[PDB]
Every structure is written in C-alpha cells, then in structure tokens.
Amino acid sequence: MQDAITSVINSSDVQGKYLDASAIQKLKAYFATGELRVRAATTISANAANIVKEAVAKSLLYSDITRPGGNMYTTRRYAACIRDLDYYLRYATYAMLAGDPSILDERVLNGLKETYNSLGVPIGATVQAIQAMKEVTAGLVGADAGKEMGIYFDYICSGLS
Amino acid sequence: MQDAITSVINSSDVQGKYLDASAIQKLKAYFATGELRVRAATTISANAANIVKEAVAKSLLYSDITRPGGNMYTTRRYAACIRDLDYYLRYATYAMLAGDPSILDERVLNGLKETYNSLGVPIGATVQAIQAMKEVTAGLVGADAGKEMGIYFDYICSGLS
Amino acid sequence: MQDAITSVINSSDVQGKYLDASAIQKLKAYFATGELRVRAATTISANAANIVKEAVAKSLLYSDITRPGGNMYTTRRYAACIRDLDYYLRYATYAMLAGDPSILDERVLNGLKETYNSLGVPIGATVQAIQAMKEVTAGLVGADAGKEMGIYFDYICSGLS
Amino acid sequence: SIVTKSIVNADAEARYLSPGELDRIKSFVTSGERRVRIAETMTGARERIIKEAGNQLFQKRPDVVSPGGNAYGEEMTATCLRDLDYYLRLITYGIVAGDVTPIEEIGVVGVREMYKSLGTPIEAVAEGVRAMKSVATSLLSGEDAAEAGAYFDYLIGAMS
Amino acid sequence: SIVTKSIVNADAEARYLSPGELDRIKSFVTSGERRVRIAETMTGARERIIKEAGNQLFQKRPDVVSPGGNAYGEEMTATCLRDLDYYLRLITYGIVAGDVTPIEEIGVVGVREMYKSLGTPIEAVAEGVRAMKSVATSLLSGEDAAEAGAYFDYLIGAMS
Amino acid sequence: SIVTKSIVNADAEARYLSPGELDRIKSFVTSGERRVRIAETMTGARERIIKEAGNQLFQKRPDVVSPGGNAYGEEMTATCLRDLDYYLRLITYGIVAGDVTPIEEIGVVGVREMYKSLGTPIEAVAEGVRAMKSVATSLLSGEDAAEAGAYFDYLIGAMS
Amino acid sequence: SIVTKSIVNADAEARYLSPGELDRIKSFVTSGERRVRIAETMTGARERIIKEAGNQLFQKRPDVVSPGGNAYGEEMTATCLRDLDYYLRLITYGIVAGDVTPIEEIGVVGVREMYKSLGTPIEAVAEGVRAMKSVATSLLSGEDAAEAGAYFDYLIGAMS
Amino acid sequence: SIVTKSIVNADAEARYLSPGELDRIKSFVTSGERRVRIAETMTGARERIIKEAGNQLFQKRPDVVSPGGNAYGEEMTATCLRDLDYYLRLITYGIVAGDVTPIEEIGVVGVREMYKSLGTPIEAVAEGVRAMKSVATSLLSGEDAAEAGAYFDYLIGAMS
Amino acid sequence: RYLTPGGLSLRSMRVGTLAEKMTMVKDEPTPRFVELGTPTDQMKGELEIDNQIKQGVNKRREQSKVFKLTNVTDKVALQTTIGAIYRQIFERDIDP
C-alpha cells in the first residue's frame, strides 16, 4: 500500500495541496538512489539461495535448536525454517525497491508475533539469524546499498522482538 | 526526552563511536543559536496568557462552538479548553529550547488521539486554533525565533491529524 | 615509473591487505581531479614554446649570463639550455598527469646535480629559471592546476638545490 | 507508483521481480524528472485549467446550470468546481507516479455509487474530465502531452 | 545536559522556567564553544591515551595482568583496555554536555555489582581512570585541564 | 595502469601526449567511480569466494590434496588456500587499475619457476582460478561480468 | 509473453488496461529489435554451444558415460546432447517472448518426474544447462549476458 | 580514425583488441552523428571564420601585411588565407575521424622545412591558427567545443 | 638492456621511487580494544532511535524530580509543592 513515492503523495494529499518545492526534492531524492536500489535487488535475487544457506550456518546450526527438541529439529521444520526465513529476505528486497519500510507492516509483521508465540518458535533465534543475514548481504551489495538494506532488516527485527 | 546535545551524544553513544566532526558541526549549530533560544523563552513566558487569547479570538469563539451544541459550551469545558491549549503552547517552548521534538513525542503525543475521540472534542478545530497560534507568536517573539518556533508547532499538527 | 594509482596499490600490496576504506579515498581524490589534469596538459603542449620563451625572458635574457664572459654565450650552449629547460617542463607535464613525482626522480633527477658540477653550469640560475617557469604556467593554465603544477616544478628545484 | 504494482504483481505469485520488470523500474526513474516538469505545468496553471474547462462543461451539457438540477445557484455550482479541483490534483499525482494507483486509491473506487447518492450524473462528469483533456494536453508540447494525455483518459474510461 | 535537567525541573512544577535558570542556560551555550575544543582534541588523541594509561596501570599494579589475574592473556588485556576505552568515550561525552549526567545515566549506576560478578577488582579499575586523568590532563593545556579533571574525579568518586 | 604506460609510450618518443590518448585518460577517470564499486564487492565476500573456490577445485583435481599430492595436510591446504587467496588480492588490484600490469609485475612473471621448484602442478593452480572465476562472476551482475572476467582470463592464459 | 502477463491480469479483474501496464508493452516494442537479434546469433551458434557443454558435462560428471550410467554408449550420448539441444531450442524464443512462460509450458512442468522415470539423474541435466551458461553468454556481447542469461536462471532453478 | 589508432596500438604488442578499447569504438559509433554536426558548422560558416580571424592575425601581427615581410596586399595576403583555409579543412577531416592523424599526415610532418624554404614565419601561422580556433570555439556551443577543442590545440603545438 | 649497479642507485634510490623497491609503510592494524568496541554494525539509520529511547526504562522514571517539605517556614518553596500535590493526586491542574 504505502510506497515512498506514495508517501510524499499521501502527505500532500491529506493537506489537499499540490507538489510543493520540498515535496519535489524529497521525491527526486528517491530517483537519485534509483540506480542503487535496482542494481542491488538484482544482486540479491541472483544470490537468494546462497545468502540463506550462509545465514543459517552462521548462526543456527550446531546448537540446541538443530538437536532433538529444538524447533528446527525435524525435516519438516528445518525445511519450513528455510522458507520462513526466505520470506524475510524476499520482502526486504521489496522494501528496498519500494524505498519505504511500510511494506513490512502490511504483509510481514502483521500477525507474525502472534504466530511465533503460539508456535514455540524462538523469536530471539530468528532475530539472531536476520542480524547475521544483514551482515552477509552487506558484503554482496557494497557499503552504499548496505546501509539501505541494513535499515529494512531492522524494521523487521524490531517488529519481532 | 532529548536535546540537541543529548540526541547527538546518545546517538553517537549507541553507535559506539566517538564524536565525529559531522556530529560536532551539529553540536556547534545549536551553540550558535543559543541567544535566539534563551530570548525566545522569555518573550513567550511574558505574555503567555495574552498569546493564548488572540489565538482563540481568531479561530474559536463568536461561532457555533461557543453556542450550545458546540463542544466547549459549558464553563468547565471552556476553562479546560484554555488549559488544554496552554499545554500546546508551553510544551512547544520546551520543544523549542531542547531543539528536538522528543518532548512532544514522549509526554504530549503518547495517547492524545484516542483521548480526543473518547471525549467528543473535534481534532480539526483544535489544530485550526494551533495554526491561529503559530502566526500570533511569530509577530510577537520576533522574526528569527518564530520560524524556529512554528516548526515544533507543526510537529503537533503532524501528529494530531 | 609509477603513478598515483600504482603507488597506492603498491602501498597496499606490501602490507598484504586489500584496498581498504583508508585507501579508496586516495583513489577518489585522484579520480575527482582526473578531469582537471587532462585539461591542464592540453594547454601546456599548445603553449610549450611560449612557456619556455617567457621563462627565460624574466631571468636569463639581457643579463650577463648571456654575455661573452658567460656560460650561455656560444649558441651550442644556448640551444642545449632551452632543451635542458624543455626536459624540465615536459616531465613536469607527466608528473602532474600521473599525480606522483616518481617519473621525475627516475629520469630528470637521475644524476643531475652531479652532472652540473662536472660541467660547470650554474645551479643558482636554474632554480631562478624554473621558478620563472612556474609563474608563467599558473597564469596560463589556471590557479587550480597551477597549484598542482607548482609542486612538481619545485620538486625539481628541491632536487637541484 | 509503478514500484507499488510491480511489487504486488510479483507478490501475487510468490516470486522475485523479473528482470523484464527491472528495466521498467530503472527507465521510469531516470526519466522521472521529465514527469516533474510535466506536473509542474499542471500546478503552475491550475487556475488556468479550471477556468477554461468549466465553460465548455456548460456548452456540451448546458443544462447542469439549469434549475431542477444539482449545479444551479452560486453555492451549488461551486461544489462542481470544488470537485473539479479534486480531480486534477490526482492526475498530477498520476503523472508523477507512473502507475494510476494513486487515482485508484483515492478517486475512482466509489464514484459509481457516491454520485448517484449525491445527484450528479456520471455522463455529465465524464464530459467534464474530457473537457479538461482538450485543454490540459494543449498546455504542453505534444510529445510530452501524449503520455500526459494517457492518464486522465483512463478516468474517463472509468467514468464511461 | 543542564537544558534537559532544567526543563524537567520546570516540567514537574509545570510552569515556564525562571530567568535565574535561563541565565544558567545562557552561560552554558556561550561557553559551549570551549567545551567542544576540550573534547575534539581528546578524540583526536584517543589511541595515544589508552595505550599509555593502560601501560601505566599494569606497571603500577601487576597482579591484574599477571596469570591467575583477570586480565591475563592478549585477549583479556585487550578487553580490559576497552573497559578503559569506554570510559574515555563517556568523559568526552560529559565534557560536551557540560554535566556529569551522561556518565551518571550510563556508566556508573551498577559498577559495584558488575565487577563483583565479573571478578575484576573495583579498586584496580578506579586506578586506571586515575592513570587516564594523569595522561589526558598532560595532553591538555594549563587552564582547560582543571574543568576536564573534575569529570575524571567524579568517575573515581563513583567507584570510590 | 593506463596512465603509467601512456606516459612511457609518449616518453620514449620524447613527445607530449597526443589528444587521442588524452581521451583514454579522461574516459578512465570517470570510469573510476564505478570500477572501485566492483572491487568493494569483491573484497567484501572474499571468504565466501575462497572457501567456495577451494571446494570447486578439490572436487575437480582430487589428487593434489589426497596424500601423495603436494597440498596434503591440514595446514598445507591452509597455505595452498592462502596461495590462491593472493590472486584475489591482485585481481582487485587489477580491477582498480583498469589494466593487467599489477597482475603482471606481481603474479605472472616467474610463476612457472616457483611451482616447478615447490612441486605443485602449474595447471592445477590455474584450474582454481577458473573455479574462482565461476563464483566471482556469479557474485556480480551482467555488466560487471566481462569487466571482471577479462582480468581473470589473463591470469589463466599466462600460467597455463 | 509480456502482453499475456497483462491481459490475463486485467481479464481477471474485469477491467481494461492500466496505462502503467500499457507502457510496459510500449517499452517492449521498442526493445524488440534489441531482443530478436540476440536470438539470431543464438541460432547461428546453435551447433557451437552444445559441443563443449557435454565436454563440460562429461569431464566433471563422468558417471553417465561410465558403465553404470544412463547415458552409456554412443547412441545414448548422441540423444543426450540432442536433449540439451532441446533446451537451447527452448531458450531462443525466451529472448523473443521476453520472459519465462513458454519455457514454463514446454520445459519445466514435467521434468522432475520424467528424467526420474527415464532413469537419469536430474542434477546432471541441471548441471548440463549451467555448464552451458558460461559458454553461451561469453559467446555473445558483454551487456547482453544479463539478458540472455536471465532465462538460464529459470532453467537452473527449476531442475535445481 | 579512432578505429585506426586502436589497431596499431594493439598490433605493436601483437594482440587482439581489448574490450575496454572497443568501448571507445562503441562510444564513437553512437557519437558519430554528433561530429558530423560539428563539421558542417565549420564548413557552413567558413567565409566568416577565415576573413575575420585572419584580420585578427593582421591586427595582432601587423608585420605580415607590411612590405619586406612574407605577405603583401594584392594576393599574398589572399594566398595566406588559402594557406590558412587548408588547416580548417584539416580540422574537419580530423574531427569526423575522432583522431589527430588527418591533421598530421597532410599538414604537420614537414612544415618546418617547407616554410623555411617558403620564407614565412611558422610561428605567425601558429598565432594565426590560434586566432582561428579562438572564434571557432565560440561558434558552435560550449559543450561540443571541448572534445573538438582537443583537436584545435594540437596544431598550435605542432608548429613550435 | 643492462645497467651498472652503481647506476641503479642513481635511478631508483630516490625518495619518490623507493616504495616499489623495498617495504616502506608497514601499517599497524586497528588495536584490539577498538575492534572489540564496535557493535559489528557500522551503519544504522532510523533504528538509532529504536536502540535509544526504546530501551526498557522509558527514560521518564529517571528524569523526574520528587518534592520534599523540609522548608515549612519558606513560603515560595511551599507553593510549588502544593501544586505538586495537586498535580499528582488529581494529576491535572485543579484550576479549572
């Protein structure tokens, strides 16, 4: 629903005004980052299955959670946890290409705290995995897009915890 | 509750870094305008009962809202409405002298929207009185302070609506 | 031999590290002035018989170094002296274009102070010639690029003296 | 914004954005400042647009100002130009967005009921947007006015 | 800061702040340029304080870095210089804010329960900031070292 | 670099620079703002590359790490992964020069005579680099594939 | 095709075409000549890419033509390189259709059962198209390695 | 041409052409039409750029018109226009090739041994062609007078 | 093709041309107390405030003064405590 171009539109809409001078340069600030967000989103989409498989090995394996009793023990749950982590990556590349972090509250963090509390998912192990994921995808996109990617993980990461 | 000094010290604290020159030129920017801030507090505190009274005289009374059927008809609701407008004037000076709108976000804009729905007071007539107030201070505190003073008045209008 | 990119590689090669964020701004300061130096060389070469003309006109002509009791006097020694002044200008074009004075220290400053005592030509007139060449050049090219050309002029004058 | 509906089309099939859509993003962005000066002519001449569009509104359908209708009288005709002001603000958003979804989220998805519950016939409204079509495209060079004309005509097709 | 500490002092009594308190703000900001000059030379000499005040600490008290002590090993000596480096960051924070309150709200609420649990002696960590005081005042001039030294003395005063 | 051999080609004729190669210097320095962006991506994922280029090498030629081979041992691979780690340092030097002479002066010239002496096979270290080429071009997009793979090509064709 | 991706989405919501979708078709038409000529040099190099692809397959994965594999004997490998020709048969209109979906009809929706039903390993033919990946884009221009290599990512990721 | 300078730059080291060098050729093709627009502005405005700038040379150097010098009023100053017209013809040969060598091989290689045998000051030709290209840069634009500016200044530095 | 070894000292032992001959800079790294102090996250934007005011003691319980009554024969110190009783028991102003 809420984009970045729509954000300066909808703030201008409820005033009933038009595109003012401050509303244009903020809108042109999104275009100046336009080559960065497109080129980084091609890089993550080409390396989706490798940025996931490093992030689970960096934080989650060889612990209590991959042993019996842990929440990623069985082959249902460890195959679920890759998919349940891969939605955090794919929607974060939506929020970079949108340029606004409000796509996460519409479609990721809505009932997510109510699920994992009812499921017995360790939220603090999830937020450790996304925090390990945020470092390794900063090395694949460079330091310019690494700040813009690094914001939108920690909008997910504070919605969990 | 922050400051221009505190929200740069603590913002550099939680990064773990020392005082950058970009943080230092923000710190000296507040230090240049300090005689503007301390003189603006004294003028607003002088005629604070007077600076409310023109702002009600343009926007609210001799209308339907003083007439019965309006919200602030009775004398309890009229004397509360001056007091509920006094907080918007007084905490804006605390928002001015700190150089940060975090006074408003912690102890003015916490639950202000739900209280106004629960009481039947119109939000739109209140914020229209604030725009009556944000011009009458600018013709009274001076030119340079009133451009700075109205910005924290607009932080109320960005939150109330 | 080496230039501003090869040296900052060779400064970061012998440490064994990669190109850090402490050496990329050595390249980024070079690449920002990359378009400035190439316009500086293309006005040197178009005026290269006039920079050497106006340099000797303030120091050596009508003096008594070109008297018959003088070093310059025979026209074999004149046309060498313009050419020995040609090779100070043309390599000063190179080091400004390279951004590093290493080409000066290999070929111009090879044994030049020890040739001149072995020949008998004066050194104290030569520093007066190149410092007369410096004030002609910075007026012709521009006060930006005349500053960086003035370093590589005086680097020869540091080596002669 | 085109970056809104190119996400929700990729979110509908649980997919990443295809590189056949990534060049639609990038060529929108680098040509995005072209869309700014198109929209600056709209807000720069909004009083010009609203004056010489409503006159021919009462020439192709001259009976809306007649009595027995909605827009008879000075206050009641002023709600038409109040509603004419509310249209071209969205098409100013529609030029800049690249997609028509600010016009979808604000000003079309209830017009089919909210006007016959107010008393304004859509066939008179659909003339009033196309009366603006003859003057808003005329206030811009026809290369840039061709794609500028390619947004509010969707609203007339969503009225008719 | 003194601006934060005087707003909330005036917020509980719920009136505009007095000119006796406003003049203390005016003396704070007019001396604001000098206190950044105290801090910005300490941050530029950040590495050449902690390496020497650490080496003055272990020479003065050797049982800490000795084996069997807490800070034995190249890792444990390194993390027991960050425990000194963290206080030099807060002292430069307290110099900018003018008061000791960004140290009191950060550094020294529960040190006697922190280092009792971690095993380091609290008497020895108060010796290191005394070595930090004797290093940093030597790197500052004659007049300005007295106002910087009071915030060094409060840190030793909180641990002892 | 381009600039350090456009000097030498112009110095040995004792001429000034022709304006044809002054285009070549001027197009090089405005390409400097994007070539270092390739090198920051390459050094950011060196441990993702070197671990993967080892496992793509040792599956292909398993005789060198099986005993009886030269890289047999726990630490002898750790030098031989380091001996392949050096070519990732030089290719990032060759990326930011736009050239191949920092590959040449550092990692080409006597590379036949080292591995003849140490005993490792000269093609077996070359097959790691094309295994390193397949992962490092998979790190980047399409327009950085040929600009990085050209310097990868020159190190393969020199050693083999 | 890209027109199919729009006019079944607008068919579902019983609507016309949004002009944000219509400029995706307009940018497709202008980029048709850049897209068709990639397939023209793919059709010229039809009998080129397949030859080393088996040589990239069988030198890394030799188990199929070893005794104990499905592609054993010269009759079976002549059909196996013919089956890799079928995937290149599929690819050269993927850079005509603009996106995946004719590959999605004819290539990937039965491949996980049929190659399993024909006794072949599914990873080996998934290896055979990603070994084809390096020797196809390098055989064409440097900018269009992202274009022609885009539909190779669908063929890799569906089988593997 | 810039194609022709590129091959002999690669043939001296016996090499195929670098893909960074083909970027200079591919940029030359897409900017090939712009240089033809540069050249027609010179040939169209030839009769105002020659009689003016030669008169600027005669105002800067009035030695030329006076008897005893090289020129004289009836045709010798007229034939110093056509000996100046040849170089403007050679610049237009040079800018459509993107290369220096159409200025070189027709009008540089033996000019000193020519004009000593002809009895003109070669430096006055260089000051005359400096007066020619001072007004040529102000003719067309400020953008196109820079990369055509790089071929103007070479002939100044060829006479002396 | 060749050059005398005394002549190579004339060519390459200068100040500018020495970094390509032997080691010259030898960069000491970041000391280990500095790299233990970074939060392994060198950049952060909006989530600065997420770690700032949003730590769990809502810095309203350490930022608020209390009122004593040691000064019963003082008069202006009495008056701001009586208002503090009014603004904590009824916790609005009792003026309207």
Ligand SMILES: *[C@H](C)[C@H]1/C(=C/c2[nH]c(/C=C3N=C(/C=C4\NC(=O)C(CC)=C4C)C(C)=C\3CCC(=O)O)c(CCC(=O)O)c2C)NC(=O)[C@@H]1C
């Ligand atoms: C006056 C311009 C408008 C108006 C106002 C009106 N407001 C109130 C009541 C309240 N306002 C507040 C708000 C705050 N109290 C605080 O301490 C702070 C922070 C400093 C804020 C922002 C509260 C808490 C109340 C009332 C709750 C209570 O009384 O317990 C009223 C009284 C409503 C009533 O029914 O008593 C009125 C009338 N009304 C108008 O018509 C004007 C538009």
Ligand SMILES: *[C@H](C)[C@H]1/C(=C/c2[nH]c(/C=C3N=C(/C=C4\NC(=O)C(CC)=C4C)C(C)=C\3CCC(=O)O)c(CCC(=O)O)c2C)NC(=O)[C@@H]1C
């Ligand atoms: C070769 C790289 C791999 C391999 C190939 C192999 N295939 C067959 C026989 C068939 N393969 C297919 C598969 C397709 N046919 C198609 O037209 C398409 C595109 C639409 C596909 C994916 C089919 C239908 C056959 C049957 C014969 C036919 O082509 O119609 C064999 C022969 C097996 C046999 O029992 O005869 C072989 C060896 N096998 C491998 O090991 C490689 C991984």
Ligand SMILES: CCC1=C(C)/C(=C/C2=NC(=C\c3[nH]c(/C=C4\NC(=O)[C@H](C)[C@H]4CC)c(C)c3CCC(=O)O)/C(CCC(=O)O)=C2C)NC1=O
């Ligand atoms: C860049 C590499 C390079 C260097 C270093 C170089 C140096 C150089 N300068 C020289 C001579 C000379 N140098 C001068 C000096 C001057 N002219 C004057 O009249 C002034 C007094 C003074 C400078 C202001 C003179 C007069 C000679 C000729 C000496 C002679 O012929 O006796 C000579 C002796 C050559 C000869 O005389 O046959 C050499 C080698 N040539 C080169 O290519």
Ligand SMILES: CCC1=C(C)/C(=C/C2=NC(=C\c3[nH]c(/C=C4\NC(=O)[C@H](C)[C@H]4CC)c(C)c3CCC(=O)O)/C(CCC(=O)O)=C2C)NC1=O
């Ligand atoms: C952007 C989203 C949006 C829409 C859709 C909208 C419609 C809208 N049109 C209205 C009135 C009106 N609308 C018209 C319509 C017209 N005038 C004519 O003559 C023509 C036939 C026709 C349009 C070309 C008229 C005459 C009124 C006044 C009706 C009345 O007062 O009863 C009103 C009530 C008065 C008001 O504007 O406050 C609304 C809410 N307002 C909005 O903010």
Ligand SMILES: CCC1=C(C)/C(=C/C2=NC(=C\c3[nH]c(/C=C4\NC(=O)[C@H](C)[C@H]4CC)c(C)c3CCC(=O)O)/C(CCC(=O)O)=C2C)NC1=O
């Ligand atoms: C900014 C506020 C702040 C403080 C005060 C702080 C203290 C602090 N010191 C620690 C460790 C430590 N601190 C020391 C320090 C010392 N050992 C000695 O004996 C000397 C007396 C002394 C230094 C002069 C040592 C050795 C450890 C490691 C404890 C251990 O490994 O047993 C730890 C646990 C590991 C770590 O995070 O570093 C904390 C949290 N951290 C903070 O963020």
Ligand SMILES: CCC1=C(C)/C(=C/C2=NC(=C\c3[nH]c(/C=C4\NC(=O)[C@H](C)[C@H]4CC)c(C)c3CCC(=O)O)/C(CCC(=O)O)=C2C)NC1=O
């Ligand atoms: C940047 C220029 C540069 C090069 C070329 C270089 C090569 C290099 N490789 C070495 C060793 C080695 N290199 C290998 C490498 C391999 N073994 C294999 O089977 C594989 C084919 C291959 C790598 C994938 C092995 C096993 C040794 C140890 C040799 C021994 O100890 O006998 C050593 C000796 C160890 C040392 O001095 O640190 C050097 C100097 N060093 C450099 O600084």
Ligand SMILES: CCC1=C(C)/C(=C/C2=NC(=C\c3[nH]c(/C=C4\NC(=O)[C@H](C)[C@H]4CC)c(C)c3CCC(=O)O)/C(CCC(=O)O)=C2C)NC1=O
């Ligand atoms: C494109 C390569 C090219 C060049 C450059 C060229 C030059 C050229 N310049 C010439 C003459 C001349 N050029 C001049 C020029 C000058 N005298 C002055 O006072 C001025 C300083 C100066 C020029 C501004 C004069 C006076 C003559 C005639 C000389 C004579 O007739 O004795 C002539 C002899 C007559 C003719 O055929 O025009 C040639 C061939 N020919 C070529 O093929």
Ligand SMILES: CCC1=C(C)/C(=C/C2=NC(=C\c3[nH]c(/C=C4\NC(=O)[C@H](C)[C@H]4CC)c(C)c3CCC(=O)O)/C(CCC(=O)O)=C2C)NC1=O
């Ligand atoms: C007896 C039942 C009971 C419990 C358990 C309890 C806990 C409790 N922990 C608190 C704060 C806290 N609790 C923690 C503890 C932690 N944070 C971490 O990161 C670690 C995972 C963890 C400890 C190892 C911290 C750090 C605060 C400080 C809040 C602040 O930042 O201001 C607070 C608020 C202030 C305080 O009283 O300290 C309560 C009330 N209260 C109770 O009535």
